[PDB]
Design a protein around this ligand. Sequence first.
Ligand SMILES: *[C@@H]1O[C@H](CO)[C@@H](O[C@@H]2O[C@H](CO)[C@@H](O)[C@H](O)[C@H]2NC(C)=O)[C@H](O)[C@H]1NC(C)=O
Ligand SMILES: *[C@@H]1O[C@H](CO)[C@@H](O[C@@H]2O[C@H](CO)[C@@H](O)[C@H](O)[C@H]2NC(C)=O)[C@H](O)[C@H]1NC(C)=O
Ligand SMILES: CC(=O)N[C@H]1[C@H]([C@H](O)[C@H](O)CO)O[C@@](O)(C(=O)O)C[C@@H]1O
Ligand SMILES: *[C@@H]1O[C@H](CO)[C@@H](O)[C@H](O)[C@H]1NC(C)=O
Ligand SMILES: *[C@@H]1O[C@H](CO)[C@@H](O)[C@H](O)[C@H]1NC(C)=O
Ligand SMILES: *[C@@H]1O[C@H](CO)[C@@H](O)[C@H](O)[C@H]1NC(C)=O
Lengths: 160, 321
Amino acid sequence: GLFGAIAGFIEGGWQGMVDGWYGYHHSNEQGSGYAADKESTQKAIDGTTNKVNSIIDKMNTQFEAVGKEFNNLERRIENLNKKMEDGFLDVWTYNAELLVLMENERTLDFHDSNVKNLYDKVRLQLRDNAKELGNGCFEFYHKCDNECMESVKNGTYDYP
Amino acid sequence: DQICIGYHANNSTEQVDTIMEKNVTVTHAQDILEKTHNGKLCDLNGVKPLILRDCSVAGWLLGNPMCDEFLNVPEWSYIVEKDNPVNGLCYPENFNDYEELKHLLSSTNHFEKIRIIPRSSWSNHDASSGVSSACPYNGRSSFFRNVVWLIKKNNAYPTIKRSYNNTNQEDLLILWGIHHPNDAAEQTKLYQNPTTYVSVGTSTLNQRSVPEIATRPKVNGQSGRMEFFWTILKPNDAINFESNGNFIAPEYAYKIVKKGGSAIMKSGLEYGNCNTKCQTPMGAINSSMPFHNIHPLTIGECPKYVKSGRLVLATGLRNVP
Ligand SMILES: *[C@@H]1O[C@H](CO)[C@@H](O[C@@H]2O[C@H](CO)[C@@H](O)[C@H](O)[C@H]2NC(C)=O)[C@H](O)[C@H]1NC(C)=O
Ligand SMILES: *[C@@H]1O[C@H](CO)[C@@H](O[C@@H]2O[C@H](CO)[C@@H](O)[C@H](O)[C@H]2NC(C)=O)[C@H](O)[C@H]1NC(C)=O
Ligand SMILES: CC(=O)N[C@H]1[C@H]([C@H](O)[C@H](O)CO)O[C@@](O)(C(=O)O)C[C@@H]1O
Ligand SMILES: *[C@@H]1O[C@H](CO)[C@@H](O)[C@H](O)[C@H]1NC(C)=O
Ligand SMILES: *[C@@H]1O[C@H](CO)[C@@H](O)[C@H](O)[C@H]1NC(C)=O
Ligand SMILES: *[C@@H]1O[C@H](CO)[C@@H](O)[C@H](O)[C@H]1NC(C)=O
């Protein structure tokens, strides 16, 4: 992906994490488990929701065809009328399709960027207290438990 | 002991497209394209449409005997006409500025019919023999019901002088016509006077039509032709008619109610006894989707029309097993 995380340095997704889009998976003495990060996930949800709404709202002034009739000696204006209505239908169809195509791409990179930044945030936390396995995981040097784990997610983690 | 950062994944099969790659499977997506309709012609917010069936707008307004179903139509939401209604001008001919009159209809929701010139008002002219086998009714020769094909009486056609003042609040659509015989002998048999005309004048309209007596191919058994005209008489304005023959005089006219906001939809469907907020010539639409690809000519509160066959927005992320 543009930010190299999703399907990148973090090879796959977690079917076991149904709590959100991005999260963690710890492993210690007490046990292991998945826990979605509610902050970033919700921040992404708001962003995508606003995007969908913006796209729609921007497509509220599109052209609207109107029925008109012409006699046998008005073929020129009938065709002008037809070319014009088809003309605008083709323009807005182009606008609708291209906007979706471009934004779909940005939406995928957006998610990719969110994962990458969540990872980097954690990396900065576990300054020298953890080992970067380079697969999206961090292996602590000296054991770390559920209270310790919750500390990282708590964003409160810090020797201080 | 480890802590790993990761992302959601599911059994989603939904796919979206991007510039560099097509069919990317994503965890969540949102379809925004309505692709279905109910295949019916419904009422628009409770108001039923005017379904002309086998009658054309002209068949209806002039009163083709085969269109009695529409002698006094009520308020309508939109109008539906077939591509080629069989019942239009029973007696062959031309309808002046027909397309402009149809366009005018498209901006109104009601034509209230009123009698501006009693048929019994023609004391010096025959107002009963004006019929033709081209406009049959109950097995006999008849004619458009809203206008009168005046004939000579007692071997005479004294000059006509009629005036009508629009004492109503609404604009009045007035229709009348003139007959083009097939030859001089016919002219004399029907109107007696050989050289005739139909002059009409309002505050804005000035016109004098003359019959063009010629011989042409038979259409509905007639080689003669009728030519119809129309005008909008403003409130308080008056219309003056004068003619020494060939006049197809008005009887009924229509008060125009610009509740404004209609449309002449071309379709072969009939009324489907249903109600909708969005109607296309192919069927109604009921959806929250911002777009639809049913048909471009719609009426009511509808989604935006596009030619797209598929339109899906990505919401979630790429779904990686
Ligand atoms: C959440 O952050 C807090 C600090 O704000 C972490 O500290 C512990 O918080 C719990 C209450 O949830 C207290 O009972 C403990 O006494 C705190 N630590 C100690 C031993 O002083 C907490 O660990 C973080 N995550 C959670 C909920 O465990
Ligand atoms: C149609 O009839 C109306 C009503 O008689 C005419 O308007 C009135 O005319 C009188 C005489 O000039 C005026 O004093 C009134 O003020 C008019 N009333 C209105 C409603 O304006 C009108 O002139 C006639 N129309 C035509 C063109 O002959
Ligand atoms: C008004 C009138 O005289 N109607 C007669 C007409 C007219 O002579 C022609 O329509 C003139 O073009 O001819 C008929 O054959 C017809 O149309 O059925 C008999 C009909 O009684
Ligand atoms: C897994 O996929 C099937 C098929 O789409 C679906 O019916 C089922 O609900 C999914 N499992 C879950 C998350 O319930
Ligand atoms: C995209 O996937 C659909 C699956 O129904 C398929 O019909 C279509 O041909 C695919 N397009 C490409 C990129 O081959
Ligand atoms: C559209 O469908 C919804 C959901 O069933 C319904 O509540 C609404 O009345 C429908 N609208 C029309 C006019 O069909």
